[PDB]
Amino acid sequence: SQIQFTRHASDVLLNLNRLRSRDILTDVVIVVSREQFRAHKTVLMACSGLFYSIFTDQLKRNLSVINLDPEINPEGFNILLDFMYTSRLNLREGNIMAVMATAMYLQMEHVVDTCRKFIKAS
Amino acid sequence: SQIQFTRHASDVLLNLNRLRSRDILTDVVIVVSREQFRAHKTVLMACSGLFYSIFTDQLKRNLSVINLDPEINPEGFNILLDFMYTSRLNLREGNIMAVMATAMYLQMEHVVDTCRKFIKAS
After folding, report:
1. How many Å is the maximal CA-CA distance in chain B?
2. Residue contact B83–A45, C-beta within 8 A
């Protein structure tokens, strides 16, 4: 009756990221300090409270470009975008603060906690 | 510096499924027989070779509606569609052969073989 594919979710994410690599079906450009990041609205929504609100909002649901607030830096966001499509969060001593603030802005609490743990450890 | 989120992939899928449920940003209607299934093209491509092809197709890529060949049965597709968004394949002795056929048509090898094996166990 019910068979569960344990690798299915990660394969899907893997494939979604390959779609991003080849820019297939990307439907929005996230702009941060003029740096452009192409993505799929649905993945953005599936990982961030902010994007969930932005894209569920009818007035903005169809924008092809979304500018983040001036206080958001490029690299911090990039680390997070990659995490979204791969489950990999490359934290470093050099970007830790930027990633945490970006995660907070994006409303990604689980990630915010991980950053805190990273800071509190080493 | 790679940290793991073994739960991220499945969290992402769950939220994608939630968007399906609420019909948020669905961008295609798949028509089987006459039944209608609203979905996300990126999800379909990440799960099936046939959809990967159809959504990069010079002719069909911008179509809002896709009609599967007439030999395909609705329930079989409904089952595979749920599988796509949940990693769970709900089978019965009465629909497993239609499910297997639908999977072959959609080019979902692993699901095909899983069904094939289950049938041979009967």
Report:
1. 51
2. no
On whether the CB atoms of residues B95 and B114 are closer than 8 A, the answer is: no
All structural domains of chain A, each given as residue ranges with its CATH number in brackets, are 1-122 (3.30.710.10)
Closest listed residue to residue A84, CA positions, set A2, A33, A28:
A28
The residues on B that touch A, with CB distances below 8 Å, are 1-6, 8-13, 15-16, 19, 24-25, 40-43, 45-47, 55-56, 83-84, 87-92, 110-111, 114, 118
Question: What are the backbone angles phi and psi of residue B52, rounded to the nearest 5°?
Answer: -55, -45
Contact between chains at A42 and B42 (C-beta distance less than 8 A): yes
User: Tokens 């779609």 sit at which residue?
Assistant: A19
Q: Do B56 and A10 touch (CB under 8 A)?
A: no
The residue of chain B with its CA nearest to that of A61 is B25
Q: How far is B46 from chain A (nearest CA, A)?
A: 5
What is the helix (H) or strand (E) element at residue B111, kind and residue range?
Answer: helix B109-121
- Give the experimental resolution in Å: 2.2
Residue with the two structure tokens 């499924």? B17
Angstroms from B85 CA to nearest CA on chain A:
8
Contact yes or no for B25/A61 (Cβ under 8 A): yes
- CA terminus-to-terminus distance, chain B: 48
Give the gap in angstroms from C-alpha A85 to the nearest C-alpha of chain B.
9
Which tokens hold the place of A121? Answer: 């450890």
